[PDB]
Amino acid sequence: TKVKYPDGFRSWYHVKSMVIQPGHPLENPFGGIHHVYANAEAIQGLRGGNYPDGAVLVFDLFDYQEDNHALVEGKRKLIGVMERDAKRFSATGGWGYEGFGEGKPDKRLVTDGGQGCFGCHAAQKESQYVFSRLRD
Amino acid sequence: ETKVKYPDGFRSWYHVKSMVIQPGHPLENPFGGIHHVYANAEAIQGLRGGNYPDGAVLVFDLFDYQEDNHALVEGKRKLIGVMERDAKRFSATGGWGYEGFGEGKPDKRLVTDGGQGCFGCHAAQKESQYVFSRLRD
Ligand code: HEC
Ligand code: HEC
Numbered sequence: 484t485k486v487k488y489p490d491g492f493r494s495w496y497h498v499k500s501m502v503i504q505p506g507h508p509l510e511n512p513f514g515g516i517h518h519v520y521a522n523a524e525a526i527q528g529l530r531g532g533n534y535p536d537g538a539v540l541v542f543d544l545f546d547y548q549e550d551n552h553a554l555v556e557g558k559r560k561l562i563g564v565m566e567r568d569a570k571r572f573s574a575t576g577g578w579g580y581e582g583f584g585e586g587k588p589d590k591r592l593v594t595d596g597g598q599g600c601f602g603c604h605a606a607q608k609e610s611q612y613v614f615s616r617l618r619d
Numbered sequence: 620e621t622k623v624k625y626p627d628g629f630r631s632w633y634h635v636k637s638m639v640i641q642p643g644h645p646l647e648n649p650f651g652g653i654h655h656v657y658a659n660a661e662a663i664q665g666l667r668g669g670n671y672p673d674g675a676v677l678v679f680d681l682f683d684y685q686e687d688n689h690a691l692v693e694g695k696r697k698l699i700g701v702m703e704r705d706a707k708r709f710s711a712t713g714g715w716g717y718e719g720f721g722e723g724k725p726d727k728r729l730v731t732d733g734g735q736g737c738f739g740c741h742a743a744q745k746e747s748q749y750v751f752s753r754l755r756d
């Protein structure tokens with residue numbers, strides 16, 4: 484009941500991006516440029532289906548540098564992961580939540596079974612706890 | 620056989636990188652906004668350090684953004700820029716054909732000069748085969 488590191492996530496479908504700048508409520512620890520990636524099974528849930536077991540969403544978070552009014556991606560700070568499994572992750576609404584420091588498999592960030600992540604994502608109960616929407 | 624194809628299905632390609640260009644930056648006009656770069660399989664071979672096969676396509680996808688409480692949030696697509704690799708067909712602009720599609724729409728072709736204006740700037744990157752983007756992790 485550990486969330487698996489999502490190997491190969493960089494090849495997945497890019498859902499959307501967003502920039503969180505200093506002063507935003509989510510600045511700690513989610514400040515920077517982030518990109519949302521979805522594997523094939525996650526796309527089915529985003530498209531209006533049910534999320535099948537095995538669906539994975541990744542929040543990929545980079546630092547950035549402001550250089551002459553351009554924001555340039557720097558280093559990866561972390562990834563956030565949601566893995567769908569209605570049985571194994573029932574305590575947190577059927578998604579398992581993990582963070583990986585710097586995107587590395589050995590740097591697990593979550594220490595409370597994913598309850599803190601869950602507490603905020605629960606506001607999106609109506610949409611299977613996922614905030615991101617497909618855009619074209 | 621000098622027209623760049625609209626790159627259908629580009630949104631499911633590999634996302635290379637992103638950048639934000641804000642007011643004040645030298646390129647705000649016309650490339651202001653949040654942009655994402657996508658590459659098909661052939662372009663990845665070229666980005667990786669391999670050579671670019673004919674048929675390689677790189678997409679610059681440009682969105683306006685809105686400021687919302689210390690967040691920049693994606694707004695409407697302004698345009699896509701497309702580079703399509705064909706050493707013989709597009710030899711006049713370095714082996715890449717350049718096109719722009721207004722709001723990403725296949726009917727809104729933007730380029731009127733055979734790609735010369737696009738090529739004039741990308742020519743600065745002769746040494747990486749006219750491509751500014753670099754792979755990252
Ligand atoms: C509110 C205080 C949050 C906490 C705590 C966590 N997340 Fe989150 N998450 C939040 C928002 C507002 C968004 C949308 C960002 C956007 O670009 O729209 C997200 C997104 C994710 C995603 C992408 C899928 C989605 O739901 O949109 C993942 C994979 C994700 N979050 C994981 C995650 C983990 C593992 C957390 C605890 C370490 C966690 N989130 C906390 C808001 C909040
Ligand atoms: C300088 C004045 C430019 C002109 C005119 C054009 N482009 Fe460009 N392009 C420029 C830069 C600095 C970058 C990199 C952006 C980044 O995030 O690093 C780009 C990128 C592209 C790409 C992505 C591939 C790459 O070379 O990195 C495409 C497909 C591309 N540009 C197409 C394009 C077209 C079709 C143009 C005329 C309509 C065009 N570019 C003009 C700088 C400049």
Ligand SMILES: [Zn+2]
Pocket residue numbers: 506689
């Ligand atoms: Zn403020």
Ligand SMILES: [Zn+2]
Pocket residue numbers: 549551552641
């Ligand atoms: Zn600035």
